[model samples]
Target chain A: SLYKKAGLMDKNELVQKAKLAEQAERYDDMAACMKSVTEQGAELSNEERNLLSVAYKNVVGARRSSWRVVSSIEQKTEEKKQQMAREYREKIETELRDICNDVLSLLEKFLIPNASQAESKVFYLKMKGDYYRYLAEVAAGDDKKGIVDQSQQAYQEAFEISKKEMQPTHPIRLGLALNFSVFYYEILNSPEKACSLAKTAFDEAIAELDTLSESYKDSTLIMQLLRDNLTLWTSGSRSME
Target chain B: LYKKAGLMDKNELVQKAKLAEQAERYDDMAACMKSVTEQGAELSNEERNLLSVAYKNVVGARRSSWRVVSSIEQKTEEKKQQMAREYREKIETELRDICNDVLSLLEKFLIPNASQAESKVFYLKMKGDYYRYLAEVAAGDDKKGIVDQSQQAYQEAFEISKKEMQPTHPIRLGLALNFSVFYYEILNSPEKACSLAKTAFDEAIAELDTLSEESYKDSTLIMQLLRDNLTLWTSRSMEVVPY
Candidate 1:
């Protein structure tokens, strides 16, 4: 719709093709489709942007989970069997690191900087924070602390920007709140901060109950998740702030 | 017909649940019992067994589908490839939803109100089974939390069985069999698997002289599985696991 081309709906075909890719869980194919459009300086539709996240996040999620399980299996492989286990662990680690780096690269180079809307910008920043947070989980010693700081900084920026531009009921803002609070609870080990962060989001969303219309289910579902974690960690706090 | 019993549709729903169970229609079975539970009926022993079996099959169906759909395929066209990915999300979503219903049903209704140890231990073991299902599909902290809960539930069921139920009781043997299975598959600890199965087989085999006729066959069958798994694991295991 944006351009006349000598080519057919190759662009349109790819965009539509990514729908099936999404349903099938073929993130690599989905990624290729969206990346092709973006490479031509073509802006993606909102759904396309989410598919971009879905693709990278899922590819990253598998590797991260494999690394999680294998690393523990590695810890148990003692005596003479450590070498094979270490080799396997390194394979999982290599894929995990590569996927995170790839995601971060795309976000920085194409997705975030070129995004036309603040909503999309907030989304990209939240993604930037997410991949870094995952990298923080896998990294160790020197690099681990650094990734943690980057993840926190990105999450903090995304949270601030989303709160300013979007209402608390907006999925992006609520999602950033949810992810950012999790960063505090899980990554930073700050239950109080997590509680205060989650409680603020939940209560603010509750205030906007009438604001939710078309996006009601998604907005409220995220609010419920926020409350779920809030109720979980608030049990540890003196009282919810 | 249900109104004739003065229990609303509870008895009517239970017959459909039972009929659905016999025909492998567990979704309908669960739906019937779910409606009955919502309306609040203290489930009798037969009804409890029906529900337990119904929920297990419901979860198992999805878990099996997850394994089949998540298999590695040769790199193919967009159409063929997409079918697997499409099913993956749907299976994961449905699997998770199914377990949530099952766990809530157990925690809120069945386990807390069960009359005896034989019943309660069975329900607790099932609680662990469903939790293990949740853990098996999950990753990282989520998986670990479910694993921890499964261990606690299984341990609780097994410990209570030790005090109140005979070693030859099918529920007791089945708990040990599945608990050892949990240690093997979920925890990735082979020694715990072998030892637990070994002790269960040892204790149950000793009581072969004392158990009842129907009990003897049921306990023997499950104990055989416990012994079979122990043998398979210990033989394949890298390190020595003692008897």
Candidate 2:
């Protein structure tokens, strides 16, 4: 089940089982396992940090998607229909917020702090942006203001590290571009900014793609996603060349 | 370049590559693994197992995400809604490609290279699940074609299970459950759903003692799932008997 169950695993065993669980499409298992490992103050390898992130993201992504739907319906309806949808959104948001806190703490306490390489630092830093962005989607007033800035700081910091240390062709670099561009386009409502960031990544990657030795299928696939967002965003603006 | 770009250390490599909404990171994993299998070399059972889930969740991320964003457009203002609508279209293209990509993997790689009967059912059940996913996103001939293949795949899996696996076997019951679900959800055939669930639940109960003590849990849990469906479907009629 993607709902994740607790298992009696040591930190090492938890990491091992987490990988196996991902292959099984069991994020709940992976999430719970990693949570145990994190709670125990175990140090994670870069790969283990990754598994932790993916495990939390899928679980969080699903709930956020559901929350989006419920929140949208609540906005459009009235009375019991609106009332129930609002309550449902709250419940899902609370569930999601708890996970967000969990992910953020894990990132701060372990992943980000222990990370040394530019790629790892950028990778963990972007996730801080990502979780903060999720909360921004639900927050109001000062709460909203705080998370909006928090997410940008995270993305902006990741961007600086990426530019300095990561190759344009690196998967992590491209991934940061893809997610960072999204933060600009959707979260900040700056289509030009999103386009600028994504276009820069896409343009530079094309120049480098011909000479690159590996990241072959992976980099190209990400390029398509970045390019996809560009085309959609450019088309949405309609005034863009 | 932790930009693994798709090489191996294979599984380890793919695991690292899959580290971001996955950046469609699973796409890279599926792509690499797909290459490995296509090289005139068969994947080990474990490789195929991971291979299958790789595509499942890769497609799953978009398809499921679309079901939500599709809502964002339906209830919002014009500009925002259109932007959201445009996204659904992008996800549309995404879902369409991966659906075919995965169906190709199942048909081309997983099914034909199979070594064991149970795993054969394993692959077939997934074949049906992938097809069912396609049918939801597809239209016209594409929808018809996908649903037919999904139908054919489930039936074939069930037929294969009956011969090779005991009624109480997890794969057998699992295939039965999905097959039943396919009838109800995809075909809109409640009668067929009940028939399928009833037949499996009825048959498995007779041999449930076939379950080993530890193995019993999974089988029994699924058996209960099958019975619950049958029980609910049979009652949805809501008509009182004149007897």
Candidate 3:
């Protein structure tokens, strides 16, 4: 029992210390602390070990692969520069794409209706964002006419889904509005549409302010953000100052 | 309905006009105003359309869109911009009462568990505070042992759940802690009483905190007050009486 308590205490301490070290850019120390922390606890179960191994391998691979790219890119021809850049970012991009799919897959795993509402909403919003990003990337690589329609559809779908799934008075719905605003204004370069959407979001957020019981509703920062969004949304692109 | 109600009685006609205006029922208000002036119900179809659009504009929170303004004929428009300041004030007064009543009703329904929990804790805390105050008053005013009435009041209130429930349950554990504080600080010496009271207070709080986070979040105010009262008792108890 003493050993079990000590292990638990050390695991908690290690987590805290490693988080601090990570924040301070002491990666080597953090890695060491993480390793020791995991090892000091008995060998984990098969599933836990698999998860840990994957994380450990990924961290090591991230560090190693970047160095390989920096060295290899030096010798790449001018024509191959774009290809080389793609090669370098391909792993990270794929990981991001897979992450979106993974979240949806997990949300679907809870077969019971309304079993994982919060997680489902989070993933749905994230998937919507990822689709927008993916479309932007496609447009960036090759300015295909199809990308505009695809991006609009993806953005609108994400916004609509989030609106339907989340409470009209929730912070998540406000975030969905802000995200849609960003896509329309920045990526799509349609400020008129962006302003209209953002204005509605701002009005909805203001109306819900009193209704929210969550601590987040009391935040002046969020209130200010909503106000700023309104200011931007109400004015045209010609310097809303 | 406004016109029909107004036509039935002369006094009702004035009341309906005022009520209609307050409700942003400009058409009804105008109709009532027209009826009072003995004007025929309408001059033409164009005049009725203009009055309808004007009423809509006044009721709507924002300006009518360009499309609506463009569709309407400019010549027939009343173009009168009379201030509905009295109408606005009357509506504000009535709406305030309506909102308070509705919001109170909705809150009562939505927050049965949370609100009930709050009221119960609040009542118990106030009773406890009053008992504490009476004991202090007795100590200052009468150079005697703790007042029997105060002690009885406290003992009965403190022992409410303890006698009914198992000692390990949260309510009973809290009562045990409450008993410790009363015994140590109120009925005993300064230093020893303070220490015992603090220990009980800590234990009670720790027990409460061990429950689910959702439940504990609501109890924070009451728990903090308990802690503060204990500290105040500790300080007061430590003070030496002058001969």
Candidate 4:
């Protein structure tokens, strides 16, 4: 009788066992048995279709109970990544703004100079030169009041010193040209001054372009953008260009 | 008087009806009397059993035919979907490559002073801008030689321009800005750069189709290699736009 019962335990035996486990409220053991037969085993036989059917049903049913576990874990992982990104950007934005604001402090120090040591003076000129370039984008986007006021004022001081110490064709001179071209075309909307300054920068850059090759691959688009800037200077504004 | 009473035969028939009723064959009792009055009973149990078996077999055969037909249709649908998916994958791959090439050209060629005296400084700035713009516009492809977030290329470029007045100074900054901005700012914050690039890439696939088939033919065997890939790209792109 035991042998007969044991042999009767083909596919139906497992099914009946699962049913009994279910009736006894041993869901965990039922699930365990189900997982073993369904997932943790070798290939099922052709005659084992009935067993396979039960296995598939248990697998899906068990997942229904455990589904929230997976979703909750996924949500937590996503939130962690978002938190890390937020923290990173928070630190980055602050430091970048501080560095940008330092340009303002340097400009003010130059405007109302104390004794004017050569080092202090050179540093002021460097700050002014660099800040003008910084403000170019701000000025391009924002109004002309902040950077424009600083640029001419800074240049006036630098011109007083470097007029004698350096050649007229200095890097600062080209900076002045680029700065004026931007101010003229973008802010003042004055084509004449814009074109004149743009021409000077273009002339200065000609020799620089000759020495380098391959580092800049797309010459056509580059020249187009340059011409576009010059054209802006000549034409007056973006609308005019 | 009528041949020693046919009514007596009617009595026998009534007796037979009673027997049939007792046997639970009421319809047979009524039918047998009608048939005896007409031409007599003709069918046997053996013949009926044979006919019943044949009829049952016919019904079973029809049901089996219907099940077989359903199975064949299901198989056909699966086969069609498989072929269609393969076709779509093949085209998508080709379109992606072609789009990348076009974007690279635009990135390289559409530079500063392209219309002007062609300064290298101007060139690099445009390159940077183009690369950055395409990072947004192109949607797919490698965003190499582009700037990264921590690099501060925009500010750096402006500084370089201020210091050197060399063509490379501003352009280097510009190039860096263009390269980096695409990743940090231009693309949507939610998606990865790779997926975004893939989207841009799919859009550019139209350029491949515009090229004449004859022109493709002229390009040689290497060019012909991607015909199926291009097909997949076109189909996949259509699928994407709708879904």
lDDT per residue as tens, model 1, B47-105:
76677677767776677667756662234546656555555666788888999898898
Q: Using TM-score as the measure, name the better of candidate 1 and candidate 4.
A: 1
- Give the count of colliding residue pairs in each prediction: 4, 3, 1, 39
| Per-residue alpha-carbon lDDT of candidate 2 for residues A38-61, written as tens digits (9 for 90 to 100) | 777655776777788889988888
For candidate 4, state the interface root-mean-square deviation in angstroms to 1 decimal: 33.9
Best by DockQ: 2
**Tens digits of lDDT, candidate 3, B1-243:** 544542334334444444343333344544544343233332222332232232232322112221122223232334211112222233334333433332232234322322333223322322342344334334355514434444554455444543443222333334334445665656675555556446545655556636556434323433454567666775621111000
Q: Please write out the lDDT profile of model 1 over residues A12-57, one tens digit for every residue.
A: 6677656655655557667777777666665667877877777777
DockQ score for candidate 3: 0.01
Better of 1 and 3 by lDDT: 1
By lDDT, the better pick of 1 and 2 is 1
lDDT tens digits, residues B16-91, model 2? 3332113333555577667666664567755665566567667766766677667655877554555456556767
- Local error of candidate 4 at A103, Å? 2.6
> What is the CAPRI rating of model 1's predicted complex?
incorrect
Best by TM-score: 2
lDDT ranking, high to low: 1, 2, 3, 4
Each model's TM-score, in the order given?
Answer: 0.48, 0.50, 0.28, 0.23
Instruction: List the candidate 1 regions with Cα displacement exceeding 4 Å.
Output: A1-9, A76-79, A234-241, B1-243
C-alpha-based local distance difference test score of model 1: 0.76
Chain B TM-score of every predicted model:
0.85, 0.77, 0.29, 0.21
Query: Which CAPRI level is candidate 2?
Result: incorrect
TM-score of 2: 0.50
